[PDB]
Amino acid sequence: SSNSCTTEDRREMQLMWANVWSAQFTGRRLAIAQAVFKDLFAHVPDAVGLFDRVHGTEIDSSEFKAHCIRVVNGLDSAIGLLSDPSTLNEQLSHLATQHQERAGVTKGGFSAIAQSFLRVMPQVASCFNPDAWSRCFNRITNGMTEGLAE
Amino acid sequence: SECGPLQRLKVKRQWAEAYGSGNGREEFGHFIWANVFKVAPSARDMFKRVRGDNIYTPAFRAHATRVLGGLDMCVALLDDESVLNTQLAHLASQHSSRGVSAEQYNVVEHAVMMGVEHEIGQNVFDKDAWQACLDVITSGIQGN
Amino acid sequence: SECGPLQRLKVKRQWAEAYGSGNGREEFGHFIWANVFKVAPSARDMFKRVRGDNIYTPAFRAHATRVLGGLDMCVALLDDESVLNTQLAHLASQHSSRGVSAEQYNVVEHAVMMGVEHEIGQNVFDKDAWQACLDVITSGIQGN
Amino acid sequence: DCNILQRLKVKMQWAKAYGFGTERAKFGNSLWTSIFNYAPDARDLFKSVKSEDMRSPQFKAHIARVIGGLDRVISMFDNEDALNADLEHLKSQHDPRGLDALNFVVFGKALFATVGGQFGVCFDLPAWESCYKVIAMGITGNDMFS
Amino acid sequence: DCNILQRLKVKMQWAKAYGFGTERAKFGNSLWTSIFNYAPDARDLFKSVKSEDMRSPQFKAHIARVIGGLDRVISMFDNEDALNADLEHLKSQHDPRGLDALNFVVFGKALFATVGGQFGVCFDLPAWESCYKVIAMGITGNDMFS
Amino acid sequence: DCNILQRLKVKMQWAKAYGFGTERAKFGNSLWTSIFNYAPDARDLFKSVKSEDMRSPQFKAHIARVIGGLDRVISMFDNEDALNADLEHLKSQHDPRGLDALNFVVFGKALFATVGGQFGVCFDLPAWESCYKVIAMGITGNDMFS
Amino acid sequence: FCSEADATIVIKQWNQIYNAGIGAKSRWTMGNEIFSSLFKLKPESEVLFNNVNVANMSSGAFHAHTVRVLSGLDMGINYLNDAGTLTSLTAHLAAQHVARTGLKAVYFDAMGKVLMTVLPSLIDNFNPDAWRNCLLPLKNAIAKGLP
Amino acid sequence: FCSEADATIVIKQWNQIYNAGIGAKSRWTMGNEIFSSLFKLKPESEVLFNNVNVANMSSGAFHAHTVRVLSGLDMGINYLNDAGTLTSLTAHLAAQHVARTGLKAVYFDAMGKVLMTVLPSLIDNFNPDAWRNCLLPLKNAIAKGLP
Amino acid sequence: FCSEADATIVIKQWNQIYNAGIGAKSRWTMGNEIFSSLFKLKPESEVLFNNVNVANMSSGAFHAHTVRVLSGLDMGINYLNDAGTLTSLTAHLAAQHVARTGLKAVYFDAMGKVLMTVLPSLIDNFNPDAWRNCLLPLKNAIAKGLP
């Protein structure tokens, strides 16, 4: 019916996220982040060339780990901010400008990474709900892909 | 005191409690910054882009959200030196051009400590571990 | 920021919560003045008639009771300009001969804000609306 | 594989896990949520039942039909003639769809995790693996279930 | 199998089911009550820890060492060098007893029924089959768990 | 009548009885169940909003518009210019239907039984009779409510 | 279909004589009693069941038939308070019947009388009104499109 | 329209600034703000409000208009969890607008942006997401049929 | 060994830093700290750990050793309120140590002081009294029979 990320979907996404997120160590975050990227790079050959600065071709590099940690931190802040849309919108604008002025990064890549997350999550999260997860992920990306090319 | 292996495990767990999953993050971040600008109002001039004049705004709250995310990332890496430094280096870049005094870093350091202690209670707050490990983190942010 | 129609409705409702019916008034008023005399002890000399030396006394509590009643009256009129000014004029008289500095008015302004925010929570406190409307009120008290 | 006794137990455990009222729908939604989490690729084989929306009246009807199938098959576990006739009937409905038999292996995993997770610790995984095989073998005819 | 994502899934599901305090003993007793119900002949292999009476302190001590071993091994799932060294240590303790490898398969079934029975419907049976094989492989060195 | 003090009393008693959320719908359904019990012939006047079935969405929409009108009108009790302009607006909607004025009297009785029945013993019947007359007067322009 | 209170009553009386704990043997016992009855009321409908070997109601082919029929009625009943799903469930069953030539609507009305005649003998304090109120709409949805 | 949880939030936030205990005075202060704002975004719509004396937004006639509009919005919000009745309530509202020649669907979008801009200044912890989820559906249904 | 209340405290404080949800990584960080410390107090015992490659405390073999030791300690602690099973668990542990020629009872005392020194740096509101009450008994029982 409606593709809107509802209040109930937000609670569900946070649950799916919590019962998979490590409060104290990054071992669990890295694994999930890297897994997603490996999946994106294998579905979008070109994409890898956008992470040259963080050593995209060296998934286990010290600097790509740092990047994955930042990606996951950013997604963590957003998912938690689903409970306070006002601030979320601000946070999502700041993420937008961070992804703008970087040729290649388009709404196409985000649709690809969404698919990557949809494949990685069920393997790591228990009771994963793809539909609820999907609606709020998109809600999140739409604020990040504001000023981007298709 | 030194930010040793043990102190690092301590800080990690205490931080996990204080920071938590997400429901208490807004208040945690508020408490911290209300303390910063109270003790050092002059610091506000540096946050004109994110409404440093009013920390009740969504714009600043988003900022406070990024800062905490910054600490979370570092604390989460206090046991992975190699990756911790790469990260501390990134944060260093994000600040390198803003002219942050060693005094302000200390103020934000104390804000954060009072905030965590306020979050988990004076009863368990490990002052030494926190002071030694936060300075390790600030040092990284300032190049060194 | 401007104390517009919307900001006024906001302040009214937030004030209603903070001020309330009557049971929490003593504590609300205490919190406010403990903050005033802490930040500006020199201000006490002006309240020698109502025991400004000890705000735990009934005499001062009665004073604190009148001040809050003053704000309540103004906030309750923030939408009736004509009558608001007549009232702000009265309060202006009650102070006209006491030599209240613009700095003290600002201190009491902040005391009141921290008090309301402490009363309804940082989570909902509308900083801009409150700052713009309280200054409208202080301005009136000082003639203009 | 799946001797008389194993059948008596799987019938017992299934009834308990299956339950009454809405509890059946819940059991069914869990089963399919797991089937699709185990193998996301299997979800597109069900476009005919709006699998893209699991809360849709069409997909819920499918859920009900399937657990209704498991329930009648399991109930007839102690009567070969009746049982094998229904397995043939079910085979008859699935064959024209040319499904990869490996999907029936995933299905079984999910069924065990769902009945097991509902029944609790005394779940008899060995018994269920042996008996589910009889079922899969009957529906697919694929000797991979021998 | 047992890729990194499955190891994480397994560490998480295990932590929840194993629990704390005396809940570990309960889980411990369920695991073994299943192992012996699934293969009654395996009980005689444990006379050295008075398996003839599962409530005896001798057998409860054994139950505790075995589940403590599952825990430490699962906790190392993310560090090969540490994991393998410890699996070899366990292999060194099981080898001299000339244990039939089929019993490790029974163990696995019992463990799945117990973790899932305790964890609930979201139990990831496939992930556990893959990763248990890895554990069994290290302890028996037998390619049966390939 | 309906002096300023009575309007305030009425605004207060109304707010309490009308309530929030679905409580307004309950009040709404009680008001109309009384109107039709008091004057069964008035029901036929509402075929345009399917009064033959009071649970129908057509009639519930009508119930909502009518009580929303009572609310907005009562909320304006303290501002003549706004009140009268809105009463004239309502008069403009009721006039073309050539409604017998006696029904407005029935309405009033039903409203009092409903507000008082919900508000409790402190219901000020006199104040409500006075102020309702004012509302009825504006909608019908009929001096019957003088 | 029928009200929540009516359906709840029906769902309860049904679960009384049908549920996962009820053996297949007692299912086809009810299965044969119903179909024997249907056939007496409408002798001409029996041949419609030649594929499931109606010739021998004690046969596996026929047993499996009455078992899947009862299973179908069971889903119907249990989904009485989930209109959306029931509409989809009955629309599916309908199609499955419209495909079989020779099936008349009257045959479904007959099955209704059989259920109203046979059930009371099996259920405790059978409520004929709540059942009639829930069965009719159900039977009509499944007999939609039949001549 | 929108979910029970989403609506719950909207209804609750709305009641915070609008309810039977809220004097009509503040009701038209919000009303004037809303319409003044609509006019700045779409000056060509101000003419549409001539019969309610929009030339003088302090006139009894216009004050009553806004009170009437906020009252409709109130009905919509309070009926979010009654999809049936709201469909009906919105169809009626729709009829009341289509009749007004000159009313462009786009004008309703502007109102949408105005509400989303003004409400946060009025409500504590305004939830733009829950409101968008509920308001948009209402908006589309009320402007359904406008050119 | 020690009382139900004393054990309750120990078990609770221990679980705070050790449990199934605690990555093996931090498990060997505590392990290296513990053994590094034991070595400084009793250098002559380091040799005893040659088969687990104590020459390289970052080796898979030694990491596994400490993980194994902390795991035993975990079992002892979690069994404090099961005197029977713990007597058994400790007798077994004792056998595993006596076999190691060179193991002096006094080395176990040193470990005792190391734990009492390190745990407070790790645990919130460490209770040295409740731990001493419980640890000492465990310690004496595990080192029972050592020269």
Ligand SMILES: *[C@@H]1O[C@H](CO[C@@H]2O[C@@H](C)[C@@H](O)[C@@H](O)[C@@H]2O)[C@@H](O[C@@H]2O[C@H](CO)[C@@H](O[C@H]3O[C@H](CO[C@H]4O[C@H](CO)[C@@H](O)[C@H](O)[C@@H]4O)[C@@H](O)[C@H](O[C@H]4O[C@H](CO)[C@@H](O)[C@H](O)[C@@H]4O)[C@@H]3O)[C@H](O)[C@H]2NC(C)=O)[C@H](O)[C@H]1NC(C)=O
């Ligand atoms: C409707 O079906 C039922 C059930 O049969 C099923 O459905 C059918 C449609 C078929 O598809 C069947 O394959 C399916 O199972 C029919 O009732 C059964 O009919 C069978 C006969 O087929 C009855 O069993 C008789 O046969 C057994 C076994 O016979 C074999 O073994 C003996 C050695 O012991 C050999 O000598 C035979 O050559 C053969 O290989 C036999 O033990 C029984 O006979 C005993 O009892 C007699 C006394 O009454 C003695 O005189 C004998 O010496 C012997 O001890 C059976 O006669 C089976 O009982 C029934 N089942 C039931 C519950 O009635 C049904 O007939 C059919 N209806 C029609 C008319 O079409």
Ligand SMILES: *[C@@H]1O[C@H](CO[C@@H]2O[C@@H](C)[C@@H](O)[C@@H](O)[C@@H]2O)[C@@H](O[C@@H]2O[C@H](CO)[C@@H](O[C@H]3O[C@H](CO[C@H]4O[C@H](CO)[C@@H](O)[C@H](O)[C@@H]4O)[C@@H](O)[C@H](O[C@H]4O[C@H](CO)[C@@H](O)[C@H](O)[C@@H]4O)[C@@H]3O)[C@H](O)[C@H]2NC(C)=O)[C@H](O)[C@H]1NC(C)=O
């Ligand atoms: C938009 O409407 C508003 C509100 O008015 C309402 O809405 C209209 C659309 C109509 O429906 C009106 O019926 C309705 O009230 C307009 O503002 C109001 O306007 C009136 C006057 O325009 C304000 O009240 C003042 O008006 C009186 C007028 O009396 C004079 O005229 C008569 C004969 O024609 C003489 O016999 C009188 O002696 C007198 O000269 C005025 O007298 C009042 O002033 C009194 O008080 C002063 C004390 O300071 C004395 O010095 C004076 O001598 C006198 O006794 C009022 O000033 C009324 O307050 C406003 N409402 C508000 C609060 O603003 C608005 O103007 C209109 N827009 C436009 C531009 O037309």
Ligand SMILES: *[C@@H]1O[C@H](CO[C@@H]2O[C@@H](C)[C@@H](O)[C@@H](O)[C@@H]2O)[C@@H](O[C@@H]2O[C@H](CO)[C@@H](O[C@H]3O[C@H](CO[C@H]4O[C@H](CO)[C@@H](O)[C@H](O)[C@@H]4O)[C@@H](O)[C@H](O[C@H]4O[C@H](CO)[C@@H](O)[C@H](O)[C@@H]4O)[C@@H]3O)[C@H](O)[C@H]2NC(C)=O)[C@H](O)[C@H]1NC(C)=O
């Ligand atoms: C105690 O053990 C630790 C951990 O090692 C583990 O434990 C041992 C007991 C054994 O069980 C090991 O199997 C187990 O891993 C020791 O530290 C580790 O040691 C390794 C190396 O000693 C570290 O990794 C580096 O080593 C590679 C070696 O590759 C070289 O040699 C081959 C042929 O022999 C050549 O073909 C290669 O081309 C290369 O020359 C080294 O290449 C790595 O460096 C890469 O990355 C650089 C990027 O900055 C490039 O510039 C290089 O070209 C190259 O590609 C690594 O530096 C491993 O990280 C550590 N572990 C950690 C995290 O410390 C420890 O040394 C031992 N104690 C002692 C003193 O023996």
Ligand code: HEM
């Ligand atoms: C919704 C999921 C995503 C999240 C949460 C996310 C988050 C982040 C964060 C936090 C940064 C670092 C910003 C900084 O500190 O400067 C970042 C950088 C970046 N992201 Fe994303 N991102 C997402 C998706 C994507 C996608 C789909 C693409 C591309 C197709 C992309 C491309 C990039 C690039 C090129 C950078 C800059 C990396 C660098 O050089 O440091 N991101 N992202």
Ligand code: HEM
């Ligand atoms: C406790 C350690 C600190 C951490 C982890 C931290 C982290 C961060 C992060 C993550 C950002 C956002 C960067 C971006 O995405 O653009 C940031 C921005 C900023 N930080 Fe810090 N910070 C710390 C201390 C400080 C201190 C002590 C000051 C100075 C008084 C400061 C001043 C700023 C300013 C001015 C910005 C830019 C905000 C903007 O306009 O976007 N930070 N910090």
Ligand code: HEM
């Ligand atoms: C926030 C706005 C303020 C309001 C609404 C307010 C209100 C009042 C009221 C109602 C009285 C009692 C007058 C009477 O009945 O005699 C009063 C008295 C007084 N106020 Fe304020 N006041 C405000 C700010 C201040 C400030 C900023 C100062 C100065 C530091 C001040 C100093 C005094 C003094 C000295 C008295 C006389 C007390 C006495 O001896 O009776 N007020 N004020």
Ligand code: HEM
């Ligand atoms: C052994 C377990 C299974 C049982 C008991 C079962 C049972 C059923 C039943 C009763 C139907 C409805 C038949 C009808 O009335 O038309 C059905 C349909 C279907 N099944 Fe299964 N099934 C099983 C496994 C599977 C598997 C593993 C797949 C493949 C991935 C599958 C794919 C389908 C499809 C595509 C349909 C048709 C849905 C439609 O009507 O559009 N089934 N199944």
Ligand code: HEM
């Ligand atoms: C992968 C699962 C298994 C794990 C983690 C495991 C772990 C352990 C551990 C930790 C011990 C005690 C070692 C010591 O302290 O000396 C042990 C002992 C033993 N295990 Fe296992 N074990 C497993 C499977 C099995 C299986 C399948 C059998 C065979 C039937 C078995 C038979 C034994 C025997 C006979 C002992 C010695 C008991 C004694 O002390 O007298 N184990 N096992």
Ligand code: HEM
């Ligand atoms: C003072 C009490 C009353 C109030 C506040 C009231 C209010 C309303 C309102 C707001 C409407 C809907 C206008 C629209 O949106 O088009 C309405 C419609 C109507 N009212 Fe009343 N009304 C009252 C009394 C009555 C009475 C006593 C009758 C007569 C029996 C009546 C008969 C009608 C009819 C026939 C409609 C039109 C229904 C339709 O849309 O088909 N009303 N009323």
Ligand code: HEM
């Ligand atoms: C309302 C009660 C009824 C229910 C719940 C019902 C249910 C079913 C079901 C579930 C099937 C099997 C579909 C499949 O999986 O292939 C079926 C088949 C069939 N039904 Fe019904 N049915 C009902 C009434 C009737 C009536 C009154 C007749 C008419 C005489 C009838 C004639 C048939 C026929 C001819 C078949 C095909 C049998 C075959 O496979 O050979 N049904 N029915």
Ligand code: HEM
């Ligand atoms: C979505 C929010 C809106 C709501 C809830 C709303 C509600 C209402 C209501 C209740 C009425 C009075 C109906 C009656 O009783 O006669 C009304 C009238 C009217 N509305 Fe709206 N409205 C909305 C948006 C708009 C917009 C965007 C326009 C266009 C510019 C508009 C133009 C009008 C006009 C021209 C009238 C008739 C005024 C008259 O009587 O002269 N409305 N509206």
Ligand code: HEM
């Ligand atoms: C009181 C705390 C202690 C606990 C809980 C403990 C526990 C353990 C455990 C579980 C093992 C491995 C048994 C196996 O599975 O083979 C072990 C081995 C060993 N322990 Fe301890 N231990 C403690 C103190 C000590 C002390 C104080 C020494 C002496 C310096 C010591 C020396 C050893 C040695 C030499 C081994 C054999 C290592 C090898 O396999 O090469 N332990 N201990």
Ligand SMILES: [Mg+2]
């Ligand atoms: Mg410092």
Ligand SMILES: [Mg+2]
């Ligand atoms: Mg000021």
Ligand SMILES: [Mg+2]
């Ligand atoms: Mg050997």
Ligand SMILES: [Mg+2]
């Ligand atoms: Mg007329």
